Design a protein around this nucleic acid. Structure first.
Lengths: 339, 54, 134
RNA sequence: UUUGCUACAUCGAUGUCGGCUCUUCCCACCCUGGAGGUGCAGCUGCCUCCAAGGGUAGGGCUGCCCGCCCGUUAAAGGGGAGCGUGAGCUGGGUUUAGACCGUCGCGAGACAGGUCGGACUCUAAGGGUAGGGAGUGCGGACCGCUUGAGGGGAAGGAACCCCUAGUACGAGAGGAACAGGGUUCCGGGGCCUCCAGUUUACCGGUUGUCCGGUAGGGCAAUGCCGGGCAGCCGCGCCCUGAGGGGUAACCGCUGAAAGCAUCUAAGCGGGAACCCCUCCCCUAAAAGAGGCGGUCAGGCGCCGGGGCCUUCCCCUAGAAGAGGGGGUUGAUGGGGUGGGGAUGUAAGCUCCAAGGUUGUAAGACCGAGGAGUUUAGUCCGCCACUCCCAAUCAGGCUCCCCC
RNA sequence: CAGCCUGGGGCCUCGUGAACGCCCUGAGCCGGUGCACAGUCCGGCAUCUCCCUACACCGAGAGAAGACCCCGUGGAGCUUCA
RNA sequence: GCGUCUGAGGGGUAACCCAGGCUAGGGAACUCGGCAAAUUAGCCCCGUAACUUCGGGAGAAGGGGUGCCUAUCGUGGUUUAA
RNA sequence: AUCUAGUCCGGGGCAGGCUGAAGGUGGGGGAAACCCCACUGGAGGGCCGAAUAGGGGUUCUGACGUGCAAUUCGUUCCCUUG
């Protein structure tokens, strides 16, 4: 008689549809957090996963000052390319539309890799001179400054592609005028990961999870399979009833697409930023990926997505604590991942 | 530390320690070595993928 | 009692109606788990237990004065492998318990065989009579 | 939400008990949150008011429902949806035909008494739901980046432990709370470094038989047995703040009606797991159908041209579509060579072999098997380098706006 | 407390080629009205068109002049103290 | 003698269904009910309880052995054959 | 009365194994009656057992249920000298 059991799955994630882009952008950004002009995110590629041995940093942890074993994910992060500067304002209708974009590639930054995504500006249409004075004229009613950046996949051979991905990253820091000066110095340059993050920080990861195709209800929602005889008896991998009513027969479990969803993670700590790839590459290569040869991040725990997945790394928006530098690492598993 | 069947080195964070009712300990680098003592009872002196062959 | 404040939770090794050996000289030899102290669960799931857990047992084999009686016991050994925080996997040869008095002291005066450290840290009175601790 | 009363609807049929599976709601509150009273010292109790955001589990007995009982738990609340749900299952109960017993009947036979056996049909026009593709509109053809009206969420809930503190309180016995930490369990979302499962790729052993023997193979639903990479998976691992505003029950301030008093009437201040924002997921088919950067060469309708798609080589993706890449200005797939792996040390040849057949003897001949050559041979749905081979040929659609 | 693997279907394509539902095509849903549970009526809130797969909750879904129950100065077989 | 129990092709082979293989720790906690599935299994030697209508129970229950190679021994058949 | 029920007349069948009744013979005992053992013998509405040798039709309340079929197919089973 009608015992209690919680519903299967979350009602807040519907629809479970396919993500419409492989690199999503955050909708919301962390507050200023009392800093000086800097970017609030970076872009990386998921490579593989291993495990290290570190000495615990958390002063409240039960294992404080002791050598504990932790899994880690490896994220390859070459420099990105700063493309344009974007200003937002509250327009008529009182919205958050875009004021203008100020592009700068002609002085230095003549790239045809960039034309694999956008058949970008001709020499005839380099009239960006009057886009900049519009920003300075309409200063004092600009609310946000954002920088368009581009990935450089051609620097990652294991990632067999050359056309880039284009996203926009927000600047948080001093005044608006101060942020405009900082955004003009990055324009057309190459932004290393160390200009944004530092070892020991927390981050938020946004990306697309591994796809799995059309699936049933026992994998999509973890419903209970019919017990005994029914394991033998007319079909077991299904739900019994599909609602009571003709009320638009409701939101009950149904089969359909599983995986390849846009999701978000919280409070993923960065343990190391390295350049010497001989300290991270295992014997025989990372299985099904290749070899690391750029700057890489060591992120403890797991990360959504498959190998070679573009990931957006963001400042923590509900941080759990505030770490300091140096989670000392004593061992890194460089053994082969086959066998 | 070293495997109890094949004699090779066990990297940290991998393997298995097996405790017997008399208190003795056995270390295993993989399931292939764990099965070869506890299940199959094969002897290591006849296999030359083992350090005990010679 | 004393080490639960760490990550006291392992592989779910034992259940209701699971059989164990009694690793002490109290008089019992075999038992069956009747209840798991502290567990609270979900629909259709059988309550579970691992090393250093308090359980209620019913003695199925032993001396006439303890046979078919209900006691309190703690799990000291388990067959199913479990991982220590320093990343090592441990495994024992059988599932065993030791029978304790209501206040926590062991009923027997001697413990047979090895004991996991998590059981010795959480239950100091058992560690006082255990000879070998693994 | 029971059981009756009535006989309005259905008798050319609305499948009639219980259980399982899955969804949602009510509040008359069992626990979790707030406030008060007490014959409230503390701990524990009892009672009243607000509040439905979250939870309410495992078993023995009976076809059950109810109920009794076992070990726990923060608590193991009570109801509705055609007593929710048989084009979802089941078939223990019940209401056919067969049969036994007791009572009743002259009998044929009856019971509302017990017992044994007894069938569960259907390929989804329509709606709904879960997902995936095209078209028209906004708005002449395209490439790229965005906002955040609106919509959904439980995305988290709870308990135990540390210190506070053997402190307050109390004769003693006993024995707290706020602030601040940790973990575990239930729910949600993900992942494959470790461990575990699988692994009809692969490697080996071996039984019976067939291919003349050895070697190599066919068959015995991989013939069976052992091991097993990648991948997928859980029994493994990671993440899963709080704050602002508005209030509920109520608690207070100033203050009269009504010289006083008074939290309320005017006028103010506080105050909850509640509601709204912050956070996470879908969002320009939002009709007020948004914003921003760039391309549509040139010459005199024609020449010429830009873009997109199929074809071609593929995988991150994939029921078909779609998605994500490469296309000689190239490492996209294969070959070659190295690396890293799985089995377990190939065939042939040399030596030994319990014995036997010979040979005057010397010697040579058979022999399950052992050792050497030999971390061998076979294999790799992983990685690196290298243009050796192939990404060629061909077809279709749509545009040249502004100036 | 489910996971992985295999044979035959399902899925995509070529050939052959039916049946049941059918006043109508006009069927989104919530509260009502009414022989007392409406696709069509009233009041609202919604709703751009087409196609593919999957699910069977609703259409008091399809299939059979209800076997239960009562009636008819309808039967048939059995019984006996009619 | 047949590939005529007379339709085929494609597919990194989706969900799901009909048949099958394997699963760590636990071992009936499932369910009306151990249903279904698993366990055991041939032959030789030893050994075998209560009960009993003295015939049975009885293959009760339970324990040990089994391949390959190299040689032998014993018993018997048959051949004009003590 | 080509199905089916019973009967009468004339025909055709049941692979392969096991147990071992009465009877018979020879040892060993006791005076005796008679007892024990070994072998031989081959009884019985005895036992195990061939998808498709023949016969049946219990389970899964398995598949099918606009069928291969107006009663079939698969698994698990029952009988087989009367």
């Amino acid at each position: 008689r009608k015992l209690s059991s919680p519903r299967r799955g979350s009602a807040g994630l519907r629809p479970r549809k396919r993500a419409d882009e492989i690199l999503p952008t955050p909708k919301n950004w962390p507050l200023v957090n009392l800093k000086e002009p800097k970017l609030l995110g970076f872009i990386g590629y998921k490579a593989g996963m291993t495990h290290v041995y570190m000495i615990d940093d958390k002063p409240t942890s039960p294992n404080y000052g002791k050598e504990v074993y932790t899994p880690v994910t490896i994220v390859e992060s070459p420099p990105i390319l700063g493309l344009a500067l974007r200003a937002y304002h509250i327009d008529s209708k009182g919205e958050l539309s875009v004021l203008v974009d100020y592009w700068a590639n002609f002085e230095e930054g003549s790239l045809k890799y960039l034309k694999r995504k956008i058949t970008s500006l001709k020499v005839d249409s380099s009239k960006m001179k009057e886009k900049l004075d519009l920003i300075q004229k309409n200063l004092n009613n600009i609310t946000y400054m954002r920088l368009l950046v581009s990935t450089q996949p051609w620097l990652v051979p294991s990632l067999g592609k050359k056309r880039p991905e284009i996203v926009e990253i927000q600047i948080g820091g001093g005044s608006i005028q101060d942020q405009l000066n900082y955004g003009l110095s990055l324009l057309g340059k190459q932004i290393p990961v160390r200009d944004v993050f530092r070892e020991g920080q927390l981050t938020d990861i946004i990306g697309v999870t591994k796809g799995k195709g059309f699936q049933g209800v026992i994998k999509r929602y973890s419903v209970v399979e019919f017990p005994r005889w029914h394991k033998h008896r007319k079909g077991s991998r299904k739900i019994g009833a599909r609602g009571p009513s003709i009320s638009t027969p409701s939101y009950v479990p149904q089969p359909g697409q599983l995986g390849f969803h846009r999701r978000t993670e919280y409070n993923k700590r960065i343990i190391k930023i390295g350049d010497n790839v001989n300290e991270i590459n295992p014997a025989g290569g990372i299985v099904n990926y290749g070899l690391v040869k750029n700057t890489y991040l060591v992120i403890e725990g797991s990360v959504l997505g498959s190998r070679k997945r573009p990931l957006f790394l963001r400042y923590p928006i509900r941080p759990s604590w505030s770490p300091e530098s140096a989670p000392k690492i004593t061992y890194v598993n460089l053994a082969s991942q086959q066998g | 530390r070293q495997c109890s069947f094949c004699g090779k080195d066990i990297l940290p964070g991998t393997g298995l320690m097996y405790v017997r009712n008399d208190g003795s300990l056995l270390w295993f680098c993989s399931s292939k070595c764990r099965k070869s003592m506890l299940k199959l009872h094969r002897d290591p002196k006849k296999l030359k993928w083992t350090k005990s062959y010679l | 009692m004393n080490v639960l404040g760490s990550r006291k939770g392992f592989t779910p090794a034992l259940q209701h109606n699971s059989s164990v050996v009694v690793a002490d000289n109290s008089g019992a030899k075999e038992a069956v788990i009747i209840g798991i102290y502290g567990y609270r669960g979900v629909l259709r799931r059988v309550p579970f237990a691992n090393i250093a857990d308090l359980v209620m047992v019913s003695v199925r084999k032993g001396s006439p004065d303890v046979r078919k009686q209900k006691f309190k016991a703690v799990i000291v050994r388990q067959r199913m492998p479990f991982r220590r925080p320093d990343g090592t996997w441990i495994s024992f040869e059988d599932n065993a318990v030791v029978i304790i008095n209501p206040d926590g002291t062991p009923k027997g005066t001697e413990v047979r065989g090895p004991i996991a450290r998590e059981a010795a840290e959480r239950w100091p009175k058992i560690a006082s009579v255990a000879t070998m601790v693994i």
